[PDB]
Amino acid sequence: GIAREDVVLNRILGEGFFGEVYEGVYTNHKGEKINVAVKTCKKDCTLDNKEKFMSEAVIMKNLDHPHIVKLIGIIEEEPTWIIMELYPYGELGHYLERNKNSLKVLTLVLYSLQICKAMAYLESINCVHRDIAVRNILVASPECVKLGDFGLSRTRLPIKWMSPESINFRRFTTASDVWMFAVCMWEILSFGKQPFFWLENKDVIGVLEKGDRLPKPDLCPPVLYTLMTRCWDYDPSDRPRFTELVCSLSDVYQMEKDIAM
Numbered sequence: 001g002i003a004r005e006d007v008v009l010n011r012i013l014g015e016g017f018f019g020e021v022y023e024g025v026y027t028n029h030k031g032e033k034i035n036v037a038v039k040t041c042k043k044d045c046t047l048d049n050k051e052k053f054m055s056e057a058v059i060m061k062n063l064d065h066p067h068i069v070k071l072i073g074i075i076e077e078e079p080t081w082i083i084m085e086l087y088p089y090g091e092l093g094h095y096l097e098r099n100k101n102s103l104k105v106l107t108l109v110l111y112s113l114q115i116c117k118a119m120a121y122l123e124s125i126n127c128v129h130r131d132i133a134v135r136n137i138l139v140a141s142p143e144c145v146k147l148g149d150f151g152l153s154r155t156r157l158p159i160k161w162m163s164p165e166s167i168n169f170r171r172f173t174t175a176s177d178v179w180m181f182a183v184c185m186w187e188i189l190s191f192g193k194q195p196f197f198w199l200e201n202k203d204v205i206g207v208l209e210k211g212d213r214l215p216k217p218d219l220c221p222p223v224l225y226t227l228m229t230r231c232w233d234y235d236p237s238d239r240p241r242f243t244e245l246v247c248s249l250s251d252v253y254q255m256e257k258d259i260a261m
């Protein structure tokens, strides 16, 4: 752990569910200047909120993975402070509306690839993620995205993104995660398009019932779109597991650095 002396703050990043994240600068217990993002808690509901914050906190100490947000340290006290590496490019949703053109599917599928690997690790430490959405993903480098942290676990509800069970029974298992994740894959190969932008929440479930799926994305293959289609199998048990999506997505992409001359 590290102390308030060590963190200079320099601007408000944005307003989380827990309010302010601030850009600032850590400075090493040995000398060095790491640029940083510092999550704090609102002006915050008695317990319900501080709890959910400590809880995200504590899961974070344990995490470790090239494609989840890096946790540098915590300061327990009043404003408790979660310190995370800064990712100077921001939400992938936006790095994406503003690059419709620069990006080659071979890229759009490395992103989805890497998130998926992030999910496979989360599965194995039995964590789930409830916000695998493109606003909740950071770009570290054009060649590298990092999942959220926030949604990390185990109101405002990304219904548009939720498997039917997740909705009917508020069960988020790993299988409903797989559904969700495919909805994020859709997003990425749709350059940041809102899933179901046309419906509002109330009549989503209906849709998926008569059997209705999200449009194939233009830049997205046949195989790949079928691989997403299985992830939206109404029946949880036909959905591919994470390790399955890794081994197989890492196909559709080494088969992609191929179609590249």
Ligand SMILES: O=C1C=c2cc(Nc3ncc(C(F)(F)F)c(NCc4ccccc4S(=O)(=O)N4CCCC4)n3)ccc2=N1
Pocket: 013, 014, 015, 016, 021, 037, 038, 039, 069, 070, 084, 085, 086, 087, 088, 089, 090, 091, 135, 136, 137, 138, 148, 149
């Ligand atoms: O314009 C910008 C430049 C940014 C750089 C960012 N770099 C960055 N590095 C690490 C994190 C971490 F680890 F805290 F999750 C981080 N978090 C802030 C954040 C992450 C995801 C989504 C949103 C945000 S946020 O910036 O908190 N935000 C909420 C309301 C709109 C903006 N940001 C983030 C957002 C930015 N917006």
